[PDB]
Write a protein that binds this ligand. Sequence first.
Ligand SMILES: [Mg+2]
Ligand SMILES: [Mg+2]
Ligand SMILES: [Mg+2]
Ligand SMILES: [Mg+2]
Ligand SMILES: [Mg+2]
Ligand SMILES: [Mg+2]
Ligand SMILES: [Mg+2]
Ligand SMILES: [Mg+2]
Lengths: 215, 215, 215, 215
Amino acid sequence: VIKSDMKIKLRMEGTVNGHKFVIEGEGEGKPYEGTQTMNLKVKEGAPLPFAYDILTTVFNRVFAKYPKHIPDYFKQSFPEGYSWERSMTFEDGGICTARNDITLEGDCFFYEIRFDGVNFPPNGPVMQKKTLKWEPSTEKMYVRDGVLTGDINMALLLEGGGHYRCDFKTTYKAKKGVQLPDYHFVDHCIEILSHDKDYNNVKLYEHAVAHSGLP
Amino acid sequence: VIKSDMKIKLRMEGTVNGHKFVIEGEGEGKPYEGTQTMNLKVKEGAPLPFAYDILTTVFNRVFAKYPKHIPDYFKQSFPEGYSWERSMTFEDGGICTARNDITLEGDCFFYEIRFDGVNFPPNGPVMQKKTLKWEPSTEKMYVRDGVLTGDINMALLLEGGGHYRCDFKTTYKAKKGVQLPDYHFVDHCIEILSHDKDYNNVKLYEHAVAHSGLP
Amino acid sequence: VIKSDMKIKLRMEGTVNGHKFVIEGEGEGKPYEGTQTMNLKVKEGAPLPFAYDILTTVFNRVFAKYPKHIPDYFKQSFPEGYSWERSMTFEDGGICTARNDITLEGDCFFYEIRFDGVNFPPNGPVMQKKTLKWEPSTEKMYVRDGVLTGDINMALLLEGGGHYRCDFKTTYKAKKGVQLPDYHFVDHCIEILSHDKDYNNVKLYEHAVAHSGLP
Amino acid sequence: VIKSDMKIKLRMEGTVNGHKFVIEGEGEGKPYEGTQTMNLKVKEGAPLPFAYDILTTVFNRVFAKYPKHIPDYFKQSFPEGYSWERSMTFEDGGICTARNDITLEGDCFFYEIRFDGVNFPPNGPVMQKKTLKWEPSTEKMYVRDGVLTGDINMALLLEGGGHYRCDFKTTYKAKKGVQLPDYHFVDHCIEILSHDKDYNNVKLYEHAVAHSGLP
Ligand SMILES: [Mg+2]
Ligand SMILES: [Mg+2]
Ligand SMILES: [Mg+2]
Ligand SMILES: [Mg+2]
Ligand SMILES: [Mg+2]
Ligand SMILES: [Mg+2]
Ligand SMILES: [Mg+2]
Ligand SMILES: [Mg+2]
């Protein structure tokens, strides 16, 4: 079902500040190593007039290395799979909502994604494309109403220094009964490995590892 | 351009808790009296599995009575028109994003609307359809970055008593240069006048009046 | 008990950005007209290194004109009286907490107030004393857990234009059983009538009127 | 200056839900190991009518193990020292503000602490003393306006299961010039080791370690 090497295909449809776009992706990862890489292409709405980094964490917690002592909500959910929904609340009032419905056929995951962003200041770092990268982060995972919730204090590093803060809340919903984990953490690191001038073509990497804190 | 009687046509496409839907509407209003009525029909995704009230304030501040001493951002923007974007932050973590692009042809306004909702608790009043109505409200309007922003403390009255709080932030963007108003308020009252069992058919009314506070 | 003319005495002890202070006040108001005036004097910590306006709304909803159709939580609570607690959440991360225990002896109200402010940016309008006034506002009043809660979208007008947003949540607790009101509003307007150079001496006025919205 | 073994003395004055109290503490820690233990005694306001856990993280990032590659803001600030201010924003609307002014004499740290809590629901876990412990956490540390800010997604584990979420923002201010760190993390774990029936006497432990994320 979930093998050492898996492929990924995705389509994202979205609107940010009223600008409509479609992004398609293909990639590969190692679910048990917690690593993955994706090649993304803008199919409609090029050139994007906003910072590409707001999209990157929307482009699957299957790709997270879970130790034996923490139930793995995500890997347990397949073959049936799971979906997630997310809000991204930025410190200057920008708010994004996103969702991913993740299905599995053979060795390929398919992602149906929707992304919407509103209320970004026109002179802020998102609409002025002044972001460099997301910093690494630690997601706090806990069960609430029988499903799994993840909260994250995120930060974008900005051109010229300084950070731009965003708070993530993701709800994750398994499509079958699975053993629920106790409170735990997932450390993440996401990076754009390469892109062309207007980010019409982007190569993206993530590494993620689950853990129980200090210790 | 904006006459004493105007017609309204709209299409809303949206997703709430992963449930996809399309709603079309036709209505009429009196821009200078600040009143309007709309007939809405669910075209795809019936029956809606969530509280219809979360949608109602997305179904145009042209329909607000502005006194002579407050510049009317909305009426001034036509014929070119305006668009708005909104976030709706509910007290139990549910978040909606919405947008409306408002165009005018002859005596008919046309609304292109997108609505997305995420992170609603499955036993909350929205997914359990336990809301009765929005209470009246007062929107705080102020200019920020050369465009108009409206903040609102909203509340849904619940079955069995009690309120469910939501905070609105709307940004309004004119498609041409207009005279900007000083800080002011818009009082609103929105009501569902009638509906059928699953809200496949709904008649909706709003009254709105701008003012400068106490006095 | 609560007469057409009432006197007010107060002492505020507080800390903002680590700066300790004491302010004493004496004033008078007309509870049934919804108006009041106060003379305030800094007794310790002069000169205050922050914008005086953050304090003003802490210096009693007895002074609000309630119409016959809305139960008056505040006037009903006396002679025993009531206390309130408030949070003030500013858009740049500054947060204040405040409380007032309001007692009545004869024709004089006595206020025991505590005020604490934290996390104000050193180059923000509060620590740079760049605020001009609070705009008028409308408080949303509703019952939650058998006591009364008030939420307010507030805004300070800034030197050189622009607004600085703050969100108030106040809980009001009667010291005896009183008839609880349905959802309603209180319009407010607060103004500094005069002050000396470092605001060691300030004369302050408020007008407040309760109402049920549109209508 | 900061030695392998240091002593700690503190006094906290505070008010929660209008209840006034004083807590004094004495303890010891190992700054370079990131560990510390404290004995706390209620001196005024016993028995506390609220969950003791809301106080525990207010009872000094000197006690955090910093690796060689991350500048240590806290240890660098002495002998002059530093102060911090914090807001604690709970998911049910409860808000606390706190501050600590940390001075050093010989081998003993002295803490002057103020704590204020407001707007806790009377049937919530704080006023009903239904909390068991804080979960471990990871603080996100970043420089903003030349001083250090820490944000934390915190959670209290509740009696009968479930979590109660709180968001911390702490600002840390050195009393002299120090080398500023790049974005980093501090993992924490705080535990009550023992207490008597009404928590008049409490023994508290914390372990904290700084790091740069994944890796
Ligand atoms: Mg936008
Ligand atoms: Mg969020
Ligand atoms: Mg939902
Ligand atoms: Mg909002
Ligand atoms: Mg401060
Ligand atoms: Mg607040
Ligand atoms: Mg309280
Ligand atoms: Mg906070």
